[PDB]
Design an enzyme around this catalytic site. Structure first.
Site, PDB file in Angstrom:
ATOM      1  N   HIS A   1      27.340 -22.418  38.757  1.00 12.96           N
ATOM      2  CA  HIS A   1      27.304 -21.690  37.479  1.00 12.96           C
ATOM      3  C   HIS A   1      27.760 -20.247  37.637  1.00 12.96           C
ATOM      4  O   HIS A   1      27.509 -19.395  36.750  1.00 12.96           O
ATOM      5  CB  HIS A   1      25.885 -21.700  36.877  1.00 12.96           C
ATOM      6  CG  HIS A   1      25.532 -22.953  36.157  1.00 12.96           C
ATOM      7  ND1 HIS A   1      25.960 -24.194  36.568  1.00 12.96           N
ATOM      8  CD2 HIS A   1      24.737 -23.166  35.077  1.00 12.96           C
ATOM      9  CE1 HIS A   1      25.469 -25.121  35.771  1.00 12.96           C
ATOM     10  NE2 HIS A   1      24.726 -24.525  34.852  1.00 12.96           N
TER      11      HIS A   1
ATOM     12  N   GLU B   1      36.404 -33.714  32.094  1.00 10.69           N
ATOM     13  CA  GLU B   1      37.258 -32.529  32.072  1.00 10.69           C
ATOM     14  C   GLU B   1      38.719 -32.889  32.240  1.00 10.69           C
ATOM     15  O   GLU B   1      39.594 -32.257  31.619  1.00 10.69           O
ATOM     16  CB  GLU B   1      36.800 -31.469  33.108  1.00 10.69           C
ATOM     17  CG  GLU B   1      35.479 -30.781  32.720  1.00 10.69           C
ATOM     18  CD  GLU B   1      34.209 -31.601  32.932  1.00 10.69           C
ATOM     19  OE1 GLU B   1      34.206 -32.626  33.652  1.00 10.69           O
ATOM     20  OE2 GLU B   1      33.138 -31.194  32.407  1.00 10.69           O
TER      21      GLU B   1
HETATM   22  C1  LIG Z   1      31.600 -31.801  35.703  1.00 15.10           C
HETATM   23  C2  LIG Z   1      30.489 -31.265  34.821  1.00 15.10           C
HETATM   24  N1  LIG Z   1      30.659 -31.003  33.526  1.00 15.10           N
HETATM   25  C3  LIG Z   1      29.651 -30.524  32.772  1.00 15.10           C
HETATM   26  C4  LIG Z   1      28.390 -30.269  33.296  1.00 15.10           C
HETATM   27  C5  LIG Z   1      27.282 -29.668  32.384  1.00 15.10           C
HETATM   28  N2  LIG Z   1      26.276 -30.701  32.113  1.00 15.10           N
HETATM   29  C6  LIG Z   1      25.041 -30.582  32.919  1.00 15.10           C
HETATM   30  S1  LIG Z   1      24.060 -31.988  32.287  1.00 15.10           S
HETATM   31  C7  LIG Z   1      25.215 -32.554  31.124  1.00 15.10           C
HETATM   32  C8  LIG Z   1      24.921 -33.754  30.314  1.00 15.10           C
HETATM   33  C9  LIG Z   1      24.680 -34.995  31.232  1.00 15.10           C
HETATM   34  O1  LIG Z   1      24.450 -36.139  30.404  1.00 15.10           O
HETATM   35  P1  LIG Z   1      23.982 -37.510  31.023  1.00 15.10           P
HETATM   36  O2  LIG Z   1      24.895 -37.796  32.168  1.00 15.10           O
HETATM   37  O3  LIG Z   1      23.893 -38.494  29.942  1.00 15.10           O
HETATM   38  O4  LIG Z   1      22.523 -37.226  31.707  1.00 15.10           O
HETATM   39  P2  LIG Z   1      21.103 -36.805  30.906  1.00 15.10           P
HETATM   40  O5  LIG Z   1      21.059 -35.215  30.905  1.00 15.10           O
HETATM   41  O6  LIG Z   1      21.172 -37.460  29.484  1.00 15.10           O
HETATM   42  O7  LIG Z   1      20.021 -37.414  31.758  1.00 15.10           O
HETATM   43  C10 LIG Z   1      26.348 -31.712  31.198  1.00 15.10           C
HETATM   44  C11 LIG Z   1      27.554 -31.895  30.276  1.00 15.10           C
HETATM   45  C12 LIG Z   1      28.234 -30.533  34.677  1.00 15.10           C
HETATM   46  N3  LIG Z   1      27.081 -30.338  35.356  1.00 15.10           N
HETATM   47  N4  LIG Z   1      29.260 -31.065  35.377  1.00 15.10           N
HETATM   48 CL   LIG Z   2      24.686 -28.058  34.877  1.00 15.34          CL
END
Ligand SMILES: Cc1ncc(C[n+]2csc(CCOP(=O)(O)OP(=O)(O)O)c2C)c(N)n1
Ligand SMILES: [Cl-]
Ligand SMILES: Cc1ncc(C[n+]2csc(CCOP(=O)(O)OP(=O)(O)O)c2C)c(N)n1
Ligand SMILES: [Cl-]
Ligand SMILES: [Cl-]
Ligand SMILES: [Cl-]
Ligand SMILES: [Cl-]
Ligand SMILES: [Cl-]
Ligand SMILES: [K+]
Ligand SMILES: [K+]
Ligand SMILES: [K+]
Ligand SMILES: [K+]
Ligand SMILES: [Mn+2]
Ligand SMILES: [Mn+2]
Lengths: 372, 336, 336, 372
Positions: free
Chosen positions: B140, B70
């Site tokens: 959320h 972000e």
């Molecule tokens: C600071 C922040 N930005 C966005 C999100 C929304 N979000 C929840 S899971 C995710 C993807 C995470 O990807 P990764 O770290 O590769 O883990 P995976 O789900 O592939 O195991 C996002 C963008 C969040 N929880 N926190």
């Molecule tokens: Cl999330």
């Protein structure tokens, strides 16, 4: 001979840009092939039968729980759910390589660590239902687990925040002279956050006994890794921080175990960080199948054992699930406690305000569902 | 559900709030060739569907995914805007805007002032899902507008409906100042209304009196407008009380005149918001109205807000400043 | 200079405000073997000298430099505190706390609540230079307390003198909640006072009435307390007006009772702070006092604050809420 | 053969952690030795005499300005100052390698870029004094320069914030189809910030024509690099992001020029980022001396030219300095403009409030020092 304090290096008298090697990346460490056969005997951990069976049963029990809670979420009985599919091996294998008191930080894919450490089905379910048995008091979204007794720091939704925190806990452990390590799990997406750069760098400069465990499954929600980074995954970032790094086959519980065990040994002895990047597949050639094949080759399992475990694990999960649904939610008073350790007088005034309001308007609130 | 949604510019069609955002974004890209849209998972249409079809329509260089970062999304956006190009950044939930707080407050907001207007990031807009959703718990559900309200140089704008969303979002995108546009996510799929197909603008820094009244002024924004509209109906039926219902719309710079003019008439004010009481934006409105309308006030200004806690999962029904909490405060104020 | 500084626990010695911070930090490390101090350039004594001699005295593992990364400093600190160890982080200027805003608001503040008290970071304190300095412009002058005041679960504490600084800092360090302690940097080398050598505590969430008065209540914090003390003197001499002068000390949770009790007596309130008016912490005090003291108010509550701009370099003398601006507002309020 | 979308790699059947190579770092590119002699003819840029003299005079004029403004600060005539000592070569050499319209982001050590682009002495001084001639309207602390005409984005105090911004400006340039590059300067300390990880990664994944120019002088205030990072400086981080990287001798204007020129050429043609890490010495075997030695070896300078330039540059700087001190400060009304493009009515009310207050209490304010 150069005399610069920022780096140790020779002069070079020709202009040459250093290229990343992304096509021929850091190789993927593997112990057993897809048929569960040990490839190179010298890498066999020779884990005892009872331990290997606990790895298998922990993974499959997690998978059973996932099936039931995923369906619960689809029906709206719980509000949210993240599965562990494809990640069962990275988590149970790494957890088995830790001491029981090594502190774990993570996020959403780490339930298998808790499962391996014997966290009760009842408490996985209590958190997801936010019922009276939840030690989190129903305050967080489902799958935001934590357990003080099992040294598993409560999960939070903001990605990557636990990374520099894990490093601080590691520094404290060093000072306490603990023979303790901290492990910190995160995904390849989360590694893009500023906080990951903070954690990696602090861990190296402050000489912390921490294992960074990055799960690389090729995706962060809809985002493929081609849009996430352009170096050779996350493992290749480690050396630029001065961090010993390795990449492993996340479908191979033995590869994960071996890497974690060696990382733990050196981290705690040398007070230095280690980075493991486990390659997995985005599913929500499986860690459960592969290990099953190994079990069969040793004579440690068979179809009757599989059928019976499949039945016993479904029953255990369904008992827990039914009990969790039937419990009340906690007292609404618990919305006000733990904001601070103590409850400020102005916060108590808000609590009293709610109690008066419910006395008059309580018929419009789901009071019958909540304790007292 | 804790709220109920209700009700000149050419051809309209029925659109829910996410569709109205897409319609705004589509109009913007059609008419401004510099404009680009970026953030986490925007390319496939976004996790709330606000960017569906836009990348196929306008190209992969104009609608594209960033890394999961972000602070980078906002700093990147600022940089696009420094060149004069329209940059429409997405922050996936408002709960996750805080990593960018330094880029927003120390950089974006101060960019024009500190350069003597040699440089600016006026063509930047940051849009983000906002507000409670029934079960979003700590991360959320948040309503961060009061954090941003203390930062001169940014505008913060929040709509109550699909028609309002498109008009306000178009005005943020075209405004010559960095804007944060908070989209009440509980409304994204909740009741459609008619929305003009072609672009139009709703002015920034202007509240809307959506119902005239003579006994009390009620002020809110986002979803909470629908709560206070219902409160006004309850006060009429049960107390014979005439309520003036106002949607603030722009948090900063806010429409001080419309609110004071209403309170000079009614002599009573109740402000409501989902965000915690302490330091919430209701305190700025209350203080200001007290300063401008002191002689007209017949009763203390009431603030009916979220409690001073993090936003709870299982306790949400008890947390929110619902219609009964608003009604009860209004009853007491009327009886003062 | 825009201010003038003025005036049981055992042996004391003359200490300026930076020396009193060092004395607090030294007492803390002496009695708590878990305690460590870290941040940018703290090892050699700090850019404002607050950690001089501490590393030689307590060791390099207890007083140490981090990389140049505020988000990391705060997240690191939280992690130390999660283990139960006392973590005293430094942010070099308060202007640079914003990179850590997510770690502070989404993490530190919510750590205990969201875990059901299974985990906490109560042993964390973040200390930082704060407030104007005559020439610090946009990024060496800021007063961020209102941004943090909207976040339940953190405490924000600001002293007015060396004696107050040591007692308040010791209480923050020992308090079982994450605290931000803002040190008014213009005071660091400006007039000493007697400060106890040995540890003592001043309570959090308690304002101090430093001068009793019957006509008007004046409230401020940090350096601004000295401005309002001078205003009280000007009002007495020029108007025959008796002013009750109050140092708030803790921004959150704040001492609502002491302020309301004063305003019930005087019937008039003026709040002053260097931070911008809009969304500043004076709006929370004003709204609250209006709610609790409505029948006692003889005149609108006045807020004399910084303008709604970034903090200017060459224009500082015109920006600050100085004694003449406070006096003039007080004159008008008295004449109301 | 591995089938993982996150990385391209072979399997490996033995456990091997990857070690950083920090002792034998990325070598330091050098064109001329300490006596100003070209080491390897093939690396001579053969810059024309007039250009090389402009490099020399820009550096020394900066140094003259530094001497005078540093003393001004010590006396409290200006409130703050950051010198350019040891950084004159990195900045003039890199600037000479850019097109005049390439956009520059930086922070505190970049005044030489402006000097090379002929920014008037009068405007360096106007900013430091915050006088009526300052196009920044006196709002920022000294040395927070900017120039729209010379494509030098106004400096801000928060470290590293300009890094992801620079990347966004680069992306916009790509789209505009510009034959333009962006260059972004920062120190090795600032590279520890989250925003540097954000910038580096975004630049690679979004394929931006940007040069990252990191100045590594071994220190960030009191903090040595041993406490800042543990990999091989900043250059070694580049490859882990997929960024072409090089390290250069920052005391060698020709090494810096050559690296920047080649980085600019490839960045603009390939839409890809380049990282240059210039090793310098913390001073506030000098870039000015070394170049002077080169000039003498070509017959391009001598002691009479040096003495005379030394005198002419002191005069030019002292004329500017005297004029700057004698100008008034801007109208206090300018404290309220540019917060937003337009001035909100509530902000105008504050401005009117100040005007009324000065009418009554104006004797207590330094009105005679400010315009109108
Ligand atoms: C600071 C922040 N930005 C966005 C999100 C929304 N979000 C929840 S899971 C995710 C993807 C995470 O990807 P990764 O770290 O590769 O883990 P995976 O789900 O592939 O195991 C996002 C963008 C969040 N929880 N926190
Ligand atoms: Cl999330
Ligand atoms: C976010 C932030 N934190 C701290 C500072 C205070 N600070 C000003 S310069 C400096 C050191 C910068 O070091 P480096 O980036 O190596 O540049 P150098 O001064 O060595 O050229 C610091 C910590 C700041 N300006 N911004
Ligand atoms: Cl099922
Ligand atoms: Cl109802
Ligand atoms: Cl001099
Ligand atoms: Cl600085
Ligand atoms: Cl005076
Ligand atoms: K987290
Ligand atoms: K805009
Ligand atoms: K504390
Ligand atoms: K900057
Ligand atoms: Mn992933
Ligand atoms: Mn440096």
């Amino acid at each position: 001979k150069p005399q610069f304090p920022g780096a140790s290096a020779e002069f070079i008298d020709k202009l040459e840009f250093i290229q990343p090697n992304v096509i021929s990346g850091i190789p993927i460490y593997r112990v057993m092939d897809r048929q569960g056969q040990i490839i190179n005997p010298s890498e066999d951990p020779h884990l005892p039968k009872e331990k290997v069976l606990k790895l298998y049963k922990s993974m499959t029990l997690l998978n059973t729980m996932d099936r039931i809670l995923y369906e619960s979420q689809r029906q709206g009985r719980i509000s949210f759910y993240m599965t562990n599919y494809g990640e069962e091996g990275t988590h149970v294998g790494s957890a088995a390589a830790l001491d029981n008191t090594d502190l774990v930080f993570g996020q959403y894919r780490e339930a298998g660590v808790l499962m391996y450490r014997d966290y009760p089905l009842e408490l996985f379910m209590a958190q997801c239902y936010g019922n009276i048995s939840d030690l989190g008091k129903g305050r967080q979204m489902p799958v935001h687990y934590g357990c003080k007794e099992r040294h598993f720091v409560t999960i939070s939704s903001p990605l990557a925040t636990q990374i520099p925190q894990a490093v601080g806990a590691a520094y404290a452990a060093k000072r306490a002279n603990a023979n303790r390590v901290v492990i910190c799990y995160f995904g390849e997406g989360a590694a893009s956050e500023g906080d990951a750069h903070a954690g990696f760098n602090f861990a190296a400069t402050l000489e912390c006994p921490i294992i960074f465990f990055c799960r690389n499954n090729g995706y962060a929600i809809s985002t493929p890794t081609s849009e996430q980074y352009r170096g050779d995954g996350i493992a290749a970032r480690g050396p630029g921080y001065g961090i010993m790094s390795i990449r492993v086959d996340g479908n191979d519980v033995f590869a994960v175990y071996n890497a974690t065990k060696e990382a733990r040994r050196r981290a705690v002895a040398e007070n230095q960080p280690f980075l493991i990047e486990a390659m997995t597949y985005r599913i929500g050639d499986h860690p459960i199948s592969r290990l099953r094949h190994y079990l069969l080759s040793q004579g440690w399992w068979d179809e009757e054992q599989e059928k019976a475990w499949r039945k016993q694990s479904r029953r255990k999960v369904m008992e827990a699930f039914e009990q969790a649904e039937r419990k009340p939610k906690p007292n609404p008073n618990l919305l006000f406690s733990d904001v601070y350790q103590e409850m400020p007088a102005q916060l108590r005034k808000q609590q009293e305000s709610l109690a008066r309001h419910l006395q008059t308007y309580g018929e419009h609130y789901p009071l019958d569902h909540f304790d007292k | 559900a804790h709220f109920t949604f209700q009700p000149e510019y050419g051809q309209t069609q029925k659109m829910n709030l996410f569709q109205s955002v897409t319609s705004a974004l589509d109009n913007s890209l059609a008419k401004d060739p510099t404009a680009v849209i970026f953030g986490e998972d925007v390319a496939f249409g976004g996790v709330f569907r606000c960017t569906v079809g836009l990348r196929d329509k306008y190209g992969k260089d104009r609608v594209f995914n960033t890394p999961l970062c972000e602070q980078g999304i906002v700093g990147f956006g600022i940089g696009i805007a420094v060149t004069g190009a329209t940059a429409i950044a997405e922050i996936q939930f408002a709960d996750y805007i805080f990593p960018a707080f330094d880029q927003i407050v120390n950089e974006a907001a101060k960019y024009r002032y500190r350069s003597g207007d040699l440089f600016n990031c006026g063509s930047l807009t940051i849009r983000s899902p906002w507000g409670c959703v029934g079960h979003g718990a700590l991360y959320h559900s948040q309503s961060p507008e009061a954090f941003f309200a203390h930062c001169p140089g940014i505008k913060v704008v929040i709509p109550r409906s699909p028609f309002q969303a498109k008009g306000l979002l178009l005005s943020c995108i075209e405004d010559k100042n960095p804007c944060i546009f908070f989209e009440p996510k509980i409304l994204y799929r909740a009741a459609a209304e008619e929305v003009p197909i072609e672009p139009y603008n709703i002015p920034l820094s202007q509240a809307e009196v959506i119902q005239e009244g003579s006994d009390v002024t009620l002020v809110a924004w986002g979803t909470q407008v629908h709560v206070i509209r219902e409160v006004a109906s309850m006060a009429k039926e049960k107390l014979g009380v005439s309520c003036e219902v106002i949607d603030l719309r722009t948090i900063i710079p806010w429409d001080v005149d419309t609110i004071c003019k209403s309170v000079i008439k009614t002599g009573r004010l109740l402000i409501s918001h989902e965000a915690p009481l302490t330091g919430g934006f209701a305190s700025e409105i209350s203080s200001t109205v007290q300063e401008e309308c002191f002689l007209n006030l017949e009763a203390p200004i009431s603030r009916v807000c979220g409690y001073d806690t993090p936003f709870p999962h299982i306790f949400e029904p008890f947390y929110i400043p619902d219609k009964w909490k608003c009604y009860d405060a209004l009853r007491k104020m009327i009886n003062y």
